Amino acid sequence: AAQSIDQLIKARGKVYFGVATDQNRLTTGKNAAIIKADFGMVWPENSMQWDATEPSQGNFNFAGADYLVNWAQQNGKLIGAGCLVWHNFLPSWVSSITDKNTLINVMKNHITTLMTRYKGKIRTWDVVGEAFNEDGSLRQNVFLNVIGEDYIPIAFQTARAADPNAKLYIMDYNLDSASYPKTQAIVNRVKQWRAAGVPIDGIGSQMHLSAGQGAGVLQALPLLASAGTPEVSILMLDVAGASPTDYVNVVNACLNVQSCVGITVMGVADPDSAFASSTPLLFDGNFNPKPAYNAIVQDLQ
């Protein structure tokens, strides 16, 4: 029978099945109805990014973010938000800053202002994103180049102070094989950071997958969970071709990792995906559940 994957994953002891969205999606088509029926958590695709919220220094705006947070409260959904510190959606005024202390203070103020506005309401903040190169070294974004590698400690310490009850995550992509240097490096660095007292509660795996990659996640996710964070999660999930096999493998990986709290997909219906031609989502363009959705339902019985 037609069922909600969020309700089913909750019945298997996980916290949520979630989806990325924003005001532009919710005011059109069938998105809001499907999200309400089948998902338990929303995340803003773009409205909480740096460009949207702080387009010039100290001059904040929350139009889209408030829309989504208020919608989630109104509609009984959990909220995740981010990314506080990454190189995407980063307005050039930030990446033009040339000195350590200036950028520290700008970064701290950005983190604190966003987290304070929504204090107590947000389950998970993605504090640091896409911090690694594929070889496992740290990505030379403006934060690393100007602050240095202490930017990661600082970002998490600041986030904990702004809202101690949010779960604080680092997230990255291409963490999908236990044999890949990037997956190994984020584990080694998170272990280091935690031993130094950096408050990293979660590793989020950004699973923008090609066909056949699901199987590798079965061993990659427990490797990520070995860094000792209280949580791991799957986010930004889509799969080229949307094979039931790939989706069921990802779900099984989360089921088999005690610290995996849930799974968030990148969107609702295929033609609205940034990767629409790969039909990589769980609903087709008529907003009907696809074979992969039905396979997830079957797998969560």
Author numbering: 2 to 302
What do the authors of the reporting publication say about this deposited model?
Cryogenic structures of HG3 and HG3.7 in the absence of a ligand revealed that β-strands 6 and 7 (located adjacent to the binding pocket), adopt two distinct backbone conformations whereas only a single conformer is observed for HG3.17. Estimating the respective populations from the volumes of duplicated cross peaks shows that the inactive species comprises ~25% of the HG3 and HG3.7 samples at 25 °C, but only 5% of HG3.17.
Here, we investigate the molecular origins of the nearly billionfold rate enhancement achieved by directed evolution of the computationally designed Kemp eliminase HG3 (7). The Kemp elimination is a well-studied model for proton transfer from carbon that has served as a benchmark for de novo design. Although the first-generation HG3 design is significantly more efficient than an “off-the-shelf” catalyst like bovine serum albumin, its specific activity was further increased 200-fold over 17 rounds of mutagenesis and screening. All HG3 variants have an inactive conformational sub-state, rooted in the original protein scaffold, which was gradually supplanted with a catalytically competent sub-state as evolution progressed.
